[PDB]
Design a protein around this ligand. Structure first.
Ligand code: BUF
Ligand code: UDP
Length: 423
């Protein structure tokens, strides 16, 4: 059985779908991963995973979409429709023939391409059910971007997904999030990268509307991009248990030079070891001599790391994160408590769930997040009794996540059900 997979062209969408693809390949499915030219330029390792990679034109890549998201997302959609159609037509000249297309839930219009080509369509949601619920209510018109929503904790305005941050892209971004539910009744399979025990009531409510399959964490060939694995893991192996602050703001968020200074000073004025992912295009905003000298005694500043392996390392005491869903889920499944510094979109909501529902992190308070506030949060997690509580809570969630992906677990059962439906 041949499965096609089409993530949105950004690492937080590619990676969870790649991990699901690796699970399905291990069950005997053939996988073809559809990437844009722009994504493929960053791909450095792919031989080992045995997945075919097929590229399509960019169609307009994230840096160009930011210049005008309303126009360029629509251009990206039109090219993706045309070019995935042409690619599927070519794949139909080869055995085994494609049978199903798993596509990012942010591109619901790919369902039409799947069905026009005689394929089953599976929408893959890369955000938890709790946050996806908000997008559904936005589409229904129940909410527009104190707030009560069914089966969610009471929210402050700042806990709703952040679209105002995008300024002239705000309305375009809000419409694309709500559009994820625009054809959900016509989808053949609805997949969520979450596990039931993490959000029992909202999953149960969602399941009362559509048959959904919770298949997360899809994370366990694990990386496509340069991760600097050797340098990162040898440095971590030099650290004692529970001593390293891991710091990352993900693949897209960028902090101003002013904000980077406060982070840098806060890490230095703490006396903790730290591994800080500062992407290559963001390095020039670090303080003058930070990467080359002042970070050398206690820090490793790196442009990308093997995040799953880092979070699994016993040296890591806590994760200062922007609260993207992959980073949130990977930390929870690793048992790593968090310092929440959300930037925009669903990160604000994830931070509220981390702090107040799952209780595995603390949130920073904006004044810019000043260095004293970051230092206080580090102290809360590394030293305080509250931090020991957050760690115990994280280990409890790690155990439930391990339950979910092991035989008899909810996510294992759902991946088996999806696989058997295809057979
Ligand atoms: C506007 C945006 C700001 C951050 C970066 O500079 C890139 C800009 C353009 C792209 C835009 C991001 C915002 C998050 C996305 C909607 C996010 C997304 C996409 C689909 C979806 O359903 O949910 C989130 C991925 C990246 C994103 O599409
Ligand atoms: O140094 C890094 C930083 C991040 N990641 C991965 O990049 C993704 C980040 O996704 P997330 O949802 O947390 O945030 P986004 O980048 O979409 O804002 C996740 O798969 C992380 O594991 C990584 O492999 N190495």
């Amino acid at each position: 059985i041949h499965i096609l997979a089409f993530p949105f062209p950004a690492k937080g969408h590619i990676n969870p779908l790649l991990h699901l693809c690796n699970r399905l390949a291990s069950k005997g499915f053939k996988i073809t991963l559809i990437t844009t030219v722009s994504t493929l330029k960053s791909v450095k390792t792919s031989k080992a995973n045995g997945i075919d990679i097929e590229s399509i034109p960019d169609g307009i890549i994230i840096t160009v979409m930011e210049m005008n998201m309303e126009l360029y997302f629509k251009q990206f959609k039109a090219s993706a429709i045309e070019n995935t159609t042409k690619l599927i037509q070519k794949l139909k000249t080869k055995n085994p023939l494609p049978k199903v297309l798993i596509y990012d839930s942010s591109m619901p219009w790919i369902l039409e391409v799947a069905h026009e080509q005689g394929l089953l369509g599976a929408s893959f949601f890369t955000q938890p059910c709790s946050v996806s619920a908000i997008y559904y209510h936005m589409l229904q018109g129940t909410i527009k971007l104190m707030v009560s929503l069914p089966y969610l904790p009471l929210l402050e305005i700042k806990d709703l997904p952040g679209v105002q941050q995008f300024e002239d892209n705000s309305e375009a971004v809000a419409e694309l999030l709500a559009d994820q539910f625009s054809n959900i009744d016509d989808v053949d399979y609805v997949l969520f990268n979450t596990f039931d025990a993490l959000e029992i009531e909202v999953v149960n409510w969602m399941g009362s509307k559509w048959p959904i399959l919770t298949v997360g964490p899809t994370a366990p060939i694990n990386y496509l991009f340069e991760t600097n694995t050797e340098v990162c893991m040898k440095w971590l192996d030099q650290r004692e248990i529970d001593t390293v602050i891991y710091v990352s703001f993900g693949s897209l968020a960028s902090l101003t030079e002013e904000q980077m200074e406060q982070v840098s000073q806060a890490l230095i004025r703490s006396n903790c070891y730290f591994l800080w992912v500062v992407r290559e295009e963001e390095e020039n905003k670090l303080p003058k001599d930070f990467k080359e000298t002042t970070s050398k005694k206690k820090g490793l500043v790196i442009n990308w790391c093997p995040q799953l392996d880092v979070l699994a390392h016993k040296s890591v005491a806590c994760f200062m994160t922007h609260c993207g869903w992959n980073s949130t889920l990977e930390a929870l499944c690793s048992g790593v408590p968090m310092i929440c510094m959300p930037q925009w979109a669903d990160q604000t909501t994830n931070a509220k769930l981390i702090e107040h529902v799952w209780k595995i992190g603390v949130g920073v308070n904006k004044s810019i997040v000043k260095r004293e506030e970051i230092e206080d949060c580090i102290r809360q997690v590394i030293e305080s009794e509250r931090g020991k509580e957050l760690k115990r809570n994280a280990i409890k969630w790690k155990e439930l996540a391990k339950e979910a992906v092991s035989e008899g677990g909810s996510s294992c059962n759902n991946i088996q059900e999806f696989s058997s439906s295809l057979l």
